[PDB]
Amino acid sequence: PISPIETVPVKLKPGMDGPKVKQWPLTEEKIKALVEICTEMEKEGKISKIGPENPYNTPVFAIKKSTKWRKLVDFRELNKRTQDFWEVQLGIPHPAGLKKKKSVTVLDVGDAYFSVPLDEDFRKYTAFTIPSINNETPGIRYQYNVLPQGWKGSPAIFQSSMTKILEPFAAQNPDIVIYQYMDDLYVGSDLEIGQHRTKIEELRQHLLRWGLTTPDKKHQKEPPFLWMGYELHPDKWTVQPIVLPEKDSWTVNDIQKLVGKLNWASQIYPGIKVRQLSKLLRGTKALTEVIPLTEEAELELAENREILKEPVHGVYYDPSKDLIAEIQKQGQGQWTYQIYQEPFKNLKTGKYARMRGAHTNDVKQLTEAVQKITTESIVIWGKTPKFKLPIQKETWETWWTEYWQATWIPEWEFVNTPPLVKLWYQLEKEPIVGAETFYVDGAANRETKLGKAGYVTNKGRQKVVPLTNTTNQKTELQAIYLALQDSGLEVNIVTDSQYALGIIQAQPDKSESELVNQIIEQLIKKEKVYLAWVPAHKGIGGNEQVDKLVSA
Amino acid sequence: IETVPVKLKPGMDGPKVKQWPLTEEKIKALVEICTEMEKEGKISKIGPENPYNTPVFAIKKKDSTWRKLVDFRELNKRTQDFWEVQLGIPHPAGLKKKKSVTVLDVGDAYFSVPLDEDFRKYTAFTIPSINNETPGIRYQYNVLPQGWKGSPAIFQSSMTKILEPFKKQNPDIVIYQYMDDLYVGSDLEIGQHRTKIEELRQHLLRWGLTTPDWMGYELHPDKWTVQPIVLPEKDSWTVNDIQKLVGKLNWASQIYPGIKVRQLSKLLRGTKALTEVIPLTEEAELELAENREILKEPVHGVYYDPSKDLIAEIQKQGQGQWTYQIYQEPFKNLKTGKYARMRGAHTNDVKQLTEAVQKITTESIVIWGKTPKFKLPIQKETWETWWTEYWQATWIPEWEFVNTPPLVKLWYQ
Ligand SMILES: Cc1ccnc2c1NC(=O)c1cccnc1N2C1CC1
Ligand SMILES: O=C(O)Cc1cc(=O)oc2c(O)c(O)ccc12
Ligand SMILES: [Mn+2]
Ligand SMILES: [Mn+2]
Numbered sequence: 001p002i003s004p005i006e007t008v009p010v011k012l013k014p015g016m017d018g019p020k021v022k023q024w025p026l027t028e029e030k031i032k033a034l035v036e037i038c039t040e041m042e043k044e045g046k047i048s049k050i051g052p053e054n055p056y057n058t059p060v061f062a063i064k065k066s067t068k069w070r071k072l073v074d075f076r077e078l079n080k081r082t083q084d085f086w087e088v089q090l091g092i093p094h095p096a097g098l099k100k101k102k103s104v105t106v107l108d109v110g111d112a113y114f115s116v117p118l119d120e121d122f123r124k125y126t127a128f129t130i131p132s133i134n135n136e137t138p139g140i141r142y143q144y145n146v147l148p149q150g151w152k153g154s155p156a157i158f159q160s161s162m163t164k165i166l167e168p169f170a171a172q173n174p175d176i177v178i179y180q181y182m183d184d185l186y187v188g189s190d191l192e193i194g195q196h197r198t199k200i201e202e203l204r205q206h207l208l209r210w211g212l213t214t215p216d217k218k219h220q221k222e223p224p225f226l227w228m229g230y231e232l233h234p235d236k237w238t239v240q241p242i243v244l245p246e247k248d249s250w251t252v253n254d255i256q257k258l259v260g261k262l263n264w265a266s267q268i269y270p271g272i273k274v275r276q277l278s279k280l281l282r283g284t285k286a287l288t289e290v291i292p293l294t295e296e297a298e299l300e301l302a303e304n305r306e307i308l309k310e311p312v313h314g315v316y317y318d319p320s321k322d323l324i325a326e327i328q329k330q331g332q333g334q335w336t337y338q339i340y341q342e343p344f345k346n347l348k349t350g351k352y353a354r355m356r357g358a359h360t361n362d363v364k365q366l367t368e369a370v371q372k373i374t375t376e377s378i379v380i381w382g383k384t385p386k387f388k389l390p391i392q393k394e395t396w397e398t399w400w401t402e403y404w405q406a407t408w409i410p411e412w413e414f415v416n417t418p419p420l421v422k423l424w425y426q427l428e429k430e431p432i433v434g435a436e437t438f439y440v441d442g443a444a445n446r447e448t449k450l451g452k453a454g455y456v457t458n459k460g461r462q463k464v465v466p467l468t469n470t471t472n473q474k475t476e477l478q479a480i481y482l483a484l485q486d487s488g489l490e491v492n493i494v495t496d497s498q499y500a501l502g503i504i505q506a507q508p509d510k511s512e513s514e515l516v517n518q519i520i521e522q523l524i525k526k527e528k529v530y531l532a533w534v535p536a537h538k539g540i541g542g543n544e545q546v547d548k549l550v551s552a
Numbered sequence: 553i554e555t556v557p558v559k560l561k562p563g564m565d566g567p568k569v570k571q572w573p574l575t576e577e578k579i580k581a582l583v584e585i586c587t588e589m590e591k592e593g594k595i596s597k598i599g600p601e602n603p604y605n606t607p608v609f610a611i612k613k614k615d616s617t618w619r620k621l622v623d624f625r626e627l628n629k630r631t632q633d634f635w636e637v638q639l640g641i642p643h644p645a646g647l648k649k650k651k652s653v654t655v656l657d658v659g660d661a662y663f664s665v666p667l668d669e670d671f672r673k674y675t676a677f678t679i680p681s682i683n684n685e686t687p688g689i690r691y692q693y694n695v696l697p698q699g700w701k702g703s704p705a706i707f708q709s710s711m712t713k714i715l716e717p718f719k720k721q722n723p724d725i726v727i728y729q730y731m732d733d734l735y736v737g738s739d740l741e742i743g744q745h746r747t748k749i750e751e752l753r754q755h756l757l758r759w760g761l762t763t764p765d766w767m768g769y770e771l772h773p774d775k776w777t778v779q780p781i782v783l784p785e786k787d788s789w790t791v792n793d794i795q796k797l798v799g800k801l802n803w804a805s806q807i808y809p810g811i812k813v814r815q816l817s818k819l820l821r822g823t824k825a826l827t828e829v830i831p832l833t834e835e836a837e838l839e840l841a842e843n844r845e846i847l848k849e850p851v852h853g854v855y856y857d858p859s860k861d862l863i864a865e866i867q868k869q870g871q872g873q874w875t876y877q878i879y880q881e882p883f884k885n886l887k888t889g890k891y892a893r894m895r896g897a898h899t900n901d902v903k904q905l906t907e908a909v910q911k912i913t914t915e916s917i918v919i920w921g922k923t924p925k926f927k928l929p930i931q932k933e934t935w936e937t938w939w940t941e942y943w944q945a946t947w948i949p950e951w952e953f954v955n956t957p958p959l960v961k962l963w964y965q
Contacts, residue, residue, distance in 0.1 A: 008599050008600060008601055009601055010601060010759070021746075042936045046645045083601070083603070084603040085600045085601065085603055086599075086600040086601075086602060086603050086690065087603070087686075088600075088604075091684040091687050092684060093683045093684045094683060097682065097683035097685075098685075129791055153600070156600035157600055159600070159687065160599055160600045163687060179685060179686075293604070300903070308801050328739070356955070357955075368931070371931060371933050371934050371937075372933075374937060375573075375933055375937060378573050378575055378937065379573045379683065380682075380683050381576075381682065381683070382574075382575050382577075382579065382682040382683070383575060383576060384574030384575075399903070401870065402870065404867075404868055404929065404957040404958075404961065405868065405929050405930055405931065405957075406868055406901035406902055406928075406929055406930040406934075407901055407902070407930070407931070407934060408900060408901060408902040408934060408938055430792075431790070431792045431826035431827050432826075433827040434827075434829070437823075437824070437826050439823060456823050457823070458823055458824060458825040492825075492826045492827075494795070494826070498959060500842075501959065502956070502957060502959070505957075506957065530826070532792060532826060533795075533799065533959070534793060534795045534798065534799055535798065535799055535802045538798060538802060538813065538817055539817035539818065539820070539821075540795060540817060540820055541791065541795075541820035541821060541822065542557060542822070542823035542824065545823050
């Protein structure tokens with residue numbers, strides 16, 4: 001039987017020849033099962049006996065579960081020599097981007113790969129041998145005429161063949177939506193149920209004329225459609241059931257799986273947090289190493305169990321209505337958002353929790369969250385959503401005007417729901433007259449890590465603090481912290497540290513360093529702070545005085 | 553009708569670059585564009601035996617309703633010695649010196665030349681679908697594609713032949729070709745210069761070669777310079793102002809050897825308040841004046857290395873201003889400049905940055921015949937989602953994204 005499907009031309013990688021692996025012998029009952037299976041495949045034209053001039057071979061095994069044996073060909077060596085193909089189904093649709101349908105049928109293309117022929121010039125490289133008993137007579141030589149299961153090009157070619165077979169049907173029926181995934185077909189429509197079931201039958205018959213069989217209406221699956229970890233109804237979607245185990249002990253493997261399930265659930269279940277649970281995975285990669293759950297991790301997991309206690313579903317996309325995304329701050333640098341078209345029904349949810357570095361502020365993290373949502377929206381719905389954000393316009397406008405990086409802000413609306421995003425402190429742009437001027441400096445030994453941090457002021461006040469287990473960097477930050485502790489509500493501080501200047505001028509309100517947090521606490525309590533910078537060791541007034549004190 | 557054989561560089565495979573997700577309006581425009589290009593035979597659909605891909609975008613040079621821009625950056629790197637060594641288009645150093653330089657798009661001419669049949673599979677591109685609902689629409693080029701550095705190398709002989717009557721007619725006009733663009737420079741009055749451009753357009757039109765229809769594609773490289781660093785002139789210096797001044801001069805001494813700050817440091821003795829007024833002594837004024845005379849002279853020993861890449865850094869200055877500098881080795885600037893434009897209602901950051909990158913790239917092409925690699929002060933994801941909204945060039949430079957702020961912001965004001 002010549003197949004009417006146009007074969008795709010396939011080449012081997014340049015300079016490579018076909019496989020030449022010899023077949024290991026198998027037991028007598030495996031060989032008898034292989035001869036029976038291959039004779040039925042030969043009748044159906046899927047394989048063909050070959051002469052001795054073919055020098056190639058690929059090993060074949062046999063194994064069972066039903067009461068039937070199954071043939072298994074190990075194409076690993078042929079796959080290494082096969083050309084690369086156009087990457088297949090790498091990105092799957094997100095259900096929040098599908099549109100509602102009245103009826104959706106799934107169709108399992110039975111025996112899919114073996115229904116698509118294989119390039120004639122390439123068939124010689126798929127040769128395999130059933131061994132004769134005791135290796136006393138010549139083995140039975142076969143080669144494939146269709147897409148072999150487990151070959152590198154079978155998924156790409158089959159999907160290509162399937163699309164070419166479907167395109168006349170879709171052209172005649174633009175009122176039908178088809179999505180192919182592996183050997184399944186999801187067919188959705190808004191037709192009245194009677195004529196929808198008629199189009200399904202017309203599709204099955206169309207497929208059948210190319211040798212593609214599909215389940216009868218008898219054995220056609222029904223809601224829901226378990227697909228890629230989702231549960232899909234024609235009018236609603238959700239994730240498959242998430243089961244978080246109760247364990248007396250937790251290893252890195254168990255918590256990596258736990259963060260994964262929690263991440264997966266966060267696309268619909270609002271409020272999922274994973275900051276404290278992901279902190280436990282820092283640095284360590286021993287899969288079996290037991291990690292003790294911290295106090296905050298136990299609470300976070302408890303908070304997630306309460307969220308996951310009862311089901312939540314998501315609605316599908318209505319292109320006729322606006323796209324709205326709203327963000328709320330959870331604290332500890334954690335954010336969650338919802339994308340919806342109408343209240344009480346979400347398209348999807350999600351979170352943004354990443355700190356870019358050691359220090360950030362809330363306005364920057366909010367902008368990064370809006371960016372993450374803008375990218376996600378373009379992928380799913382092909383457009384940008386209207387934003388509702390817990391920030392007042394004056395707060396963002398003063399931030400992105402003075403932020404050293406370029407940024408783009410979409411049209412948005414202020415939602416008054418606390419906690420609001422705010423600028424907790426703002427350094428002065430010009431020095432403060434009548435405010436004391438602190439010349440701060442620090443120094444430390446790179447071996448003993450013993451340090452000093454102090455200041456000299458124009459009023460004659462001087463101070464030095466001893467420091468242990470510190471660096472030149474930390475001392476320069478301790479020096480600014482010192483001058484903030486010992487100054488009034490207005491203060492000029494002059495440092496020589498470009499490092500410390502870059503941190504504080506970034507105006508952070510959150511940090512992974514306890515020291516920086518304490519400096520943030522002081523800057524909030526101040527009224528006016530001016531931070532100035534001079535080069536070290538250039539004869540610059542009060543800087544040379546405080547440099548001599550802490551150097552000693 | 554006879555195709556030029558093209559090959560990759562030895563030991564290199566074709567490009568396999570991800571297609572960026574696109575908005576729905578750009579997917580439609582790309583589908584309409586490509587449906588016509590396929591009817592006109594320029595491109596054909598391909599199958600799964602073609603594993604290569606090159607990203608495509610939709611941009612918009614002002615017109616009624618969308619043009620296709622292919623990011624051949626990867627394929628250009630992988631066919632390099634074919635176009636830079638074998639058929640390299642040399643660079644005339646006089647183009648930067650002409651009073652006026654006009655830029656003309658001749659990329660439409662490539663569409664008449666067929667592409668080497670065994671090379672077409674490397675021009676494969678994909679039109680994405682919204683939410684991956686359908687497999688991408690896969691095309692490959694049958695003719696010379698715009699934005700490919702091989703298209704001018706192949707069309708070069710045909711271009712020299714078409715331009716030959718115009719050059720013998722106008723021996724003083726400089727003509728340089730970079731990819732799909734012609735750069736035409738003259739020393740004429742701006743009125744006579746625009747007439748000469750129209751003449752050249754009519755020459756190309758007469759030989760069947762279509763083209764477009766004080767600023768814009770019209771440049772003036774004789775007014776460009778390398779920009780000087782400047783110190784403020786004040787009547788009252790506070791302790792803070794002098795500390796700003798000694799800080800800048802200390803940074804300047806990293807570039808200029810002869811900078812001195814001793815007389816200025818000695819004004820700030822003994823732990824002063826920042827806001828205290830310090831009148832400049834005679835010795836510091838002369839120290840300040842001598843440093844000002846050093847910064848009006850070019851830094852010497854700065855040379856262009858054709859073996860090295862050009863680097864372009866940009867700083868956001870606020871007030872719609874942006875400063876840039878082009879270099880190959882740090883602190884040895886080959887050019888520095890500034891950019892500014894003032895329409896509050898229509899204008900935003902990404903907008904300005906995008907127009908600055910295109911301006912710097914054009915200055916780079918005119919001067920060195922090569923685009924620089926940009927250190928862009930922007931989030932990676934933010935730039936990748938919005939740069940095609942304001943791109944009006946047919947080429948795309950290399951860029952990376954700087955994540956640390958510089959204090960050198962005010963040092964370039
Ligand atoms: C798994 C999958 C992937 C992509 N699209 C769909 C589906 N499956 C559905 O069940 C579905 C449900 C609702 C709307 N579209 C759906 N469909 C589409 C075909 C009508
Ligand atoms: O400027 C330098 O050469 C390094 C340097 C950085 C700094 O933050 O503080 C410094 C300092 O207090 C010194 O006494 C010497 C050098 C530095
Ligand atoms: Mn210091
Ligand atoms: Mn010091």
